[PDB]
Design a protein around this ligand. Structure first.
Ligand SMILES: *[C@@H]1O[C@H](CO[C@H]2O[C@@H](C)[C@@H](O)[C@@H](O)[C@@H]2O)[C@@H](O[C@@H]2O[C@H](CO)[C@@H](O)[C@H](O)[C@H]2NC(C)=O)[C@H](O)[C@H]1NC(C)=O
Ligand SMILES: *[C@H]1O[C@H](CO[C@H]2O[C@@H](C)[C@@H](O)[C@@H](O)[C@@H]2O)[C@@H](O[C@@H]2O[C@H](CO)[C@@H](O)[C@H](O)[C@H]2NC(C)=O)[C@H](O)[C@H]1NC(C)=O
Ligand SMILES: *[C@@H]1O[C@H](CO[C@H]2O[C@@H](C)[C@@H](O)[C@@H](O)[C@@H]2O)[C@@H](O)[C@H](O)[C@H]1NC(C)=O
Ligand SMILES: *[C@@H]1O[C@H](CO)[C@@H](O)[C@H](O)[C@H]1NC(C)=O
Ligand SMILES: *[C@@H]1O[C@H](CO)[C@@H](O)[C@H](O)[C@H]1NC(C)=O
Ligand SMILES: *[C@@H]1O[C@H](CO)[C@@H](O)[C@H](O)[C@H]1NC(C)=O
Ligand SMILES: [Cl-]
Ligand SMILES: [Cl-]
Ligand SMILES: [Cl-]
Ligand SMILES: [Cl-]
Ligand SMILES: [Cl-]
Ligand SMILES: [Cl-]
Ligand SMILES: [Cl-]
Ligand code: NA
Length: 527
């Protein structure tokens, strides 16, 4: 019997066998009052408190969300879909602890992505037991509200203030500060890590003064709040809430009455209608996401980043080589995960229209001019490759590099990586290369499980990334010091060094996508 006394009452865990040892897991500990009825759209309230034992022995409900139904039966897409029941009653977190119980372990808190509209902490690729077993860190992960239920905003109105899902995350951090010591964790050694919308969340926790004392350091995998899809304007946010109201027959003149009507709607009606609030979205559109609320975020985050108003600490930031390809099969013409997707110039042009619906003819022309300087060949896959790079550079790579540059200008150590290894198991086809989302399994150490038929070179690579990430968490420095590795240099503006992660040549390079990012970061905002 593994019973731990938390601030709120006792919880029961279970033991797992992992690589010839044990990890103790507590799956599904509640951390907030379930946000139902009148609590829908509100900030999470603190937990009622209980005597007797809460059994934390299975993953909890995932938050309400629309499911990816694009490729039924296909593992490449369905692996991302939730794997417990959907419920509004979903504010639970998970804790993996090394055995024997550690004395004062560093804690890593994972925040999932899913574009702020989907995701859950229970996915197989987010299973923290390997990290716990291999590096003797404590791993924690939480479910937080997404879509309208988590991000619906009528700014200043505490019935629906915005950022509720970011506040769920923050309450989970607070839970760790208050309880992790009872589990053998060090509340003073907490690293946040997250991928995509989860990495954008981690970066907003660097900006939010309520989060400042709830963590030490931060790891941003393929995302940051300055990505163009990650923060919603207050004009866009109100238009969208108003639209959702109209769509559900919930339009009233009293802002407060609207929320009351929305609170009487069942979650399916809200979910069904979220897709249609943006008047024309793209495959990267965020219907309801982070807003400037005067609470979690006290000002536009670009202004805070530029003027140095953020927690001074070390960061670890990186991207994958083909960030953009995953999105091409969710609406660009001529693209398919079942053939080689060789597209013409014409299709390339129509694909720009899908990703850049608001942009002038001049603006799309200058994207094309910039990305079609073939040295060389011509060379059938030229346009297919160009569109993936457009989408990946504009949405993920140039913003992560810009985030890292601006952050490091205020004198902290930053480390940047470029992940270029394509999983031997990737279910998506070869043309999609090193996709968005597919470093996660290496970070969580899935290729260390030799029963799983990743390659030896993959086990070596993951073992090494697990060590770098644990070293950054524990010591603020992501070295692998023992195996004659490449030293990871700090990223500074000026040299802008970064490390590549792959199975052969890990190397130090500079100025990733220099020409492309000058285009997106400085020229494109003007068109
Ligand atoms: C690669 O496939 C695309 C995708 O559409 C197709 O899915 C395929 C697996 C295929 O079996 C086909 O039946 C299905 O329509 C092909 O583009 C499609 O081409 C046709 C015109 O022939 C259009 O009617 C479709 O709208 C268009 N699809 C999309 C999403 O735009 C594509 O040509 C094929 N590419 C090759 C062979 O290079
Ligand atoms: C937000 O306000 C209006 C409302 O438009 C939305 O109404 C919803 C109920 C939903 O059906 C959604 O598709 C629709 O967009 C926007 O007006 C739209 O956009 C243009 C304006 O020139 C028009 O073509 C339509 O009147 C309307 N769209 C559709 C598809 O019918 C308005 O643009 C938007 N506000 C912004 C962008 O700030
Ligand atoms: C556990 O270690 C505590 C502090 O260690 C941390 O100090 C911070 C500066 C930060 O760097 C962390 O990463 C360091 O690990 C110490 O204060 C506590 O007393 C310890 N508690 C124990 C051993 O039970
Ligand atoms: C919790 O855990 C154990 C099963 O391992 C059991 O003895 C007890 O009934 C449980 N309490 C429940 C299910 O409420
Ligand atoms: C609108 O309705 C709410 C809820 O009953 C009320 O408290 C509020 O004061 C009203 N405001 C206006 C301006 O009518
Ligand atoms: C370092 O080297 C050996 C292989 O010679 C291996 O057993 C060990 O896991 C490696 N450690 C890391 C952290 O990569
Ligand atoms: Cl599963
Ligand atoms: Cl704004
Ligand atoms: Cl490249
Ligand atoms: Cl042309
Ligand atoms: Cl190396
Ligand atoms: Cl250089
Ligand atoms: Cl490059
Ligand atoms: Na020009």
């Amino acid at each position: 019997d593994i019973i731990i006394a938390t601030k709120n009452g006792k919880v029961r865990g279970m033991q797992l066998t992992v690589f010839g040892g044990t990890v103790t897991a507590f799956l599904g500990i509640p951390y907030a009052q379930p946000p139902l009825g009148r609590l829908r759209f509100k900030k999470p309230q603190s937990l009622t408190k209980w005597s007797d034992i809460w059994n934390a022995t299975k993953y909890a409900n995932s938050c309400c969300q629309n499911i990816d139904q694009s490729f039924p039966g296909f593992h490449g897409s369905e692996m991302w879909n939730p794997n417990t029941d959907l419920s509004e009653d979903c504010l639970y977190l998970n804790v993996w602890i090394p055995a024997p119980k550690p004395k004062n372990a560093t804690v890593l808190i994972w925040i999932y992505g899913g574009h702020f509209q989907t995701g859950t902490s229970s996915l197989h690729v987010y299973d923290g037991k390997f990290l716990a077993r291999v590096e003797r860190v404590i791993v924690v992960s939480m479910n937080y509200r997404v879509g309208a239920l988590g991000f619906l905003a009528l700014p200043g109105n505490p019935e629906a203030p915005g950022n509720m899902g970011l506040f769920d995350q923050q309450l989970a951090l607070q839970w760790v500060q208050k309880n992790i010591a009872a589990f053998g964790g060090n509340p003073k050694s907490v690293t946040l890590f997250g991928e995509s919308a989860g990495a954008a969340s981690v970066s907003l926790h660097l900006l939010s003064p309520g989060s400042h004392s709830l963590f030490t350091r931060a790891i941003l995998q393929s995302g940051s709040f300055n990505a163009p899809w990650a923060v919603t304007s207050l004009y866009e946010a109100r238009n969208r809430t108003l639209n959702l109201a109209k769509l559900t027959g919930c339009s009233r003149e009293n802002e407060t009455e609207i929320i009351k009507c929305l609170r009487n709607k069942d979650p399916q009606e809200i979910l069904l209608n979220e897709a249609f609030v943006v008047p024309y979205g793209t495959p990267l559109s965020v219907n309801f996401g982070p807003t400037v609320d005067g609470d979690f975020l006290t000002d536009m985050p670009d202004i805070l980043l530029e003027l140095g108003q953020f927690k001074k600490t070390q960061i670890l930031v990186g991207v994958n080589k083909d960030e953009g390809t995953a999105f091409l099969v969710y609406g660009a013409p001529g693209f398919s995960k079942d053939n080689n997707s060789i597209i013409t110039r014409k299709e390339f042009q129509e694909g720009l229209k899908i990703f850049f619906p608001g942009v002038s003819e001049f603006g799309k022309e200058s994207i094309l001019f910039h990305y079609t300087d073939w040295v060389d060949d011509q060379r059938p896959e030229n346009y297919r490759e160009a569109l993936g790079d457009v989408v990946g550079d504009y949405n993920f790579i140039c913003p992560a590099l810009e985030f890292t540059k601006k952050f490091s200008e205020w004198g902290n150590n930053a480390f940047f990586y470029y992940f270029e290894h394509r999983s031997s198991k990737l279910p998506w086809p070869e043309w999609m290369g090193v996709m968005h989302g597919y470093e996660i399994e290496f970070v969580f150490g899935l290729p260390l499980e030799r029963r799983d038929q990743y390659t030896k070179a993959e086990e070596i690579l993951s073992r090494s990334i697990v060590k770098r990430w644990a070293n950054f968490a524990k010591y603020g420095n992501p070295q692998e010091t023992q195996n004659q590795s490449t030293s990871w240099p700090v990223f500074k503006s000026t040299e802008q060094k970064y490390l590549t992660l792959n199975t052969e040549s890990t190397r130090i390079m500079t100025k990733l996508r220099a020409q492309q990012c000058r285009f997106w970061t400085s020229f494109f905002p003007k068109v």
